[PDB]
Amino acid sequence: PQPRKKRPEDFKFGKILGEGSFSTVVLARELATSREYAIKILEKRHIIKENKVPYVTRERDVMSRLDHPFFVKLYFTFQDDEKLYFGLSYAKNGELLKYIRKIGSFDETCTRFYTAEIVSALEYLHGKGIIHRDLKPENILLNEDMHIQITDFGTAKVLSNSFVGTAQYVSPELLTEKSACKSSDLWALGCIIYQLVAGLPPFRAGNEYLIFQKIIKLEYDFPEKFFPKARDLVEKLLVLDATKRLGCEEMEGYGPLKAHPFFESVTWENLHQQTPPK
Ligand SMILES: CN(C)CCCn1cc(C2=C(c3c[nH]c4ccccc34)C(=O)NC2=O)c2ccccc21
In this structure, the number of other CB atoms found within 10 A of the CB of residue 4 comes to 7
Method by which the coordinates were obtained = X-ray
- Contact (Cβ atoms closer than 8 angstroms) between residue 89 and residue 73: yes
Strand 36-43 and strand 83-88: the pairing is antiparallel
- Both 240 and 102 in one domain: the answer is yes
- Both 68 and 114 in one domain: the answer is no
- Both 170 and 270 in one domain: the answer is yes
Residue 37 identity (one-letter amino acid): Y
All residues at 6 or more sequence positions from 75 whose CB lies less than 8 Å from its CB, including other chains: 37, 87, 88, 89
- Going from the Cα of 18 to the center of ligand 1, the distance in angstroms, rounded, reads 7
- Both 261 and 213 in one domain: the answer is yes
- Contact (Cβ atoms closer than 8 angstroms) between residue 129 and residue 159: yes
- Contact (Cβ atoms closer than 8 angstroms) between residue 200 and residue 211: no
Rounded (10°) angle between helices 182-198 and 228-237:
150
The finding on whether 17 has its CB within 6 A of some atom of ligand 1 is yes
- Going from the Cα of 39 to the center of ligand 1, the distance in angstroms, rounded, reads 10
- Both 55 and 18 in one domain: the answer is yes
* Distance from C-alpha of 96 to C-alpha of 195, rounded to nearest angstrom: 11
* Distance from C-alpha of 275 to C-alpha of 154, rounded to nearest angstrom: 30
- Contact (Cβ atoms closer than 8 angstroms) between residue 38 and residue 91: yes
- Both 180 and 70 in one domain: the answer is no
- The phi and psi torsions of 186 (rounded to 5 degrees) equal -70, -35
- Both 159 and 250 in one domain: the answer is yes
- Counting from 1 in the atom list of ligand 1, the atom nearest the Cα of 89 is 23
Q: Which domain holds residue 88?
A: 1-94
- The phi and psi torsions of 13 (rounded to 5 degrees) equal -75, 145
- Counted residue by residue, the chain has a size of 278
The finding on whether 38 has its CB within 6 A of some atom of ligand 1 is yes
- Going from the Cα of 135 to the center of ligand 1, the distance in angstroms, rounded, reads 13
Indicate the annotated binding residues: 21-23, 40, 89-91, 95, 138, 152
- Report CA torsion sign: 20, 21, 27, 29: negative
Among residues 65, 94, 123, the one where a domain terminates is: 94
* Distance from C-alpha of 94 to C-alpha of 146, rounded to nearest angstrom: 10
- The residue among 60, 86, 59 whose CA lies nearest residue 75 is 86
CA distances from 46 to 22, 41, 51, 66, 196 (A): 7, 12, 8, 27, 37
Residue 184 identity (one-letter amino acid): S
- Going from the Cα of 48 to the center of ligand 1, the distance in angstroms, rounded, reads 22
**CATH classification of the domain holding 219:** 1.10.510.10
Torsion angle, alpha carbons of 52, 125, 17, 198, to 10: -120
Indicate the annotated binding residues for ATP: 21-23, 40, 89-91, 95, 138, 152
Q: Ligand 1: which of 29, 40, 95, 169 to mutate, most ligand atoms within 8 Å of CB?
A: 95
Residue of minimum CA distance from atom 17 in ligand 1:
18
Rounded (10°) angle between helices 108-127 and 182-198:
170
* Distance from C-alpha of 57 to C-alpha of 67, rounded to nearest angstrom: 18
Instruction: Give bridge partners of residue 78 from the DSSP assignment.
Output: 85
Residue 138 identity (one-letter amino acid): E
- Contact (Cβ atoms closer than 8 angstroms) between residue 72 and residue 91: yes
- Contact (Cβ atoms closer than 8 angstroms) between residue 143 and residue 93: yes
The finding on whether 138 has its CB within 6 A of some atom of ligand 1 is yes
Secondary structure of the chain in the HEC alphabet?
Answer: CCCCCCCHHHEEEEEEEEECCCEEEEEEEECCCCCEEEEEEEEHHHHHHCCCHHHHHHHHHHHCCCCCCCECCEEEEEECCCEEEEEECCCCCCEHHHHHHHHCCCCHHHHHHHHHHHHHHHHHHHHCCEECCCCCHHHEEECCCCCEEECCCCCCEECCCCCCCCHHHCCHHHHCCCCCCHHHHHHHHHHHHHHHHHCCCCCCCCCHHHHHHHHHHCCCCCCCCCCHHHHHHHHHHCCCCHHHCCCCHHHCCHHHHHHCHHHCCCCHHHHHHCCCCC
The finding on whether 180 has its CB within 6 A of some atom of ligand 1 is no
- Both 2 and 128 in one domain: the answer is no
- Both 223 and 263 in one domain: the answer is yes
Q: Ligand 1: which of 62, 66, 151, 153 to mutate, most ligand atoms within 8 Å of CB?
A: 151
- Both 133 and 234 in one domain: the answer is yes
Task: Give the angle 247-188-176 at the CA atoms, nearest 5°.
Answer: 95
**CATH classification of the domain holding 12:** 3.30.200.20
- Going from the Cα of 19 to the center of ligand 1, the distance in angstroms, rounded, reads 9
* Distance from C-alpha of 92 to C-alpha of 98, rounded to nearest angstrom: 12
* Distance from C-alpha of 266 to C-alpha of 270, rounded to nearest angstrom: 10
Q: What is the resolution of this structure in A?
A: 2.5
All residues at 6 or more sequence positions from 160 whose CB lies less than 8 Å from its CB, including other chains: none
- Both 180 and 108 in one domain: the answer is yes
Catalytic residues: 134
* Distance from C-alpha of 61 to C-alpha of 77, rounded to nearest angstrom: 11
Number of compact structural domains in the chain:
2
- Both 103 and 40 in one domain: the answer is no
Residue of minimum CA distance from atom 29 in ligand 1:
152
